[PDB]
């Protein structure tokens, strides 16, 4: 029914049409997680290399 906010220009046009009305982590915490998984990666590789030394 109701057509509103019609803006025309050389390139096209735009409008709305209404049919009915209604009824963050910090840089510190990010470097912490990234390095905390680097520790688990190191720990596991060192258990491996230890086993391989046995």
């Amino acid at each position: 029914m109701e057509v509103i906010e019609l803006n025309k220009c050389t390139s096209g046009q735009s409008f709305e049409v209404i049919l009915k009305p209604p009824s963050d982590p910090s840089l510190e915490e990010i470097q912490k997680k990234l390095e905390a998984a680097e520790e688990r990666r190191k720990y596991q590789e060192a258990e491996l290399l230890k086993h391989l030394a046995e």
Binding site: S11, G12, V17, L19, K20, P22, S23
Partner: peptide, 26 residues
Amino acid sequence: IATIKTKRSIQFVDWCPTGFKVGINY
């Protein structure tokens, strides 16, 4: 739009106006 609204199921949530913002680029 007016023919389509009468042929198709278009339910909006209660807290939002049933409508269509439209853009045309010729």
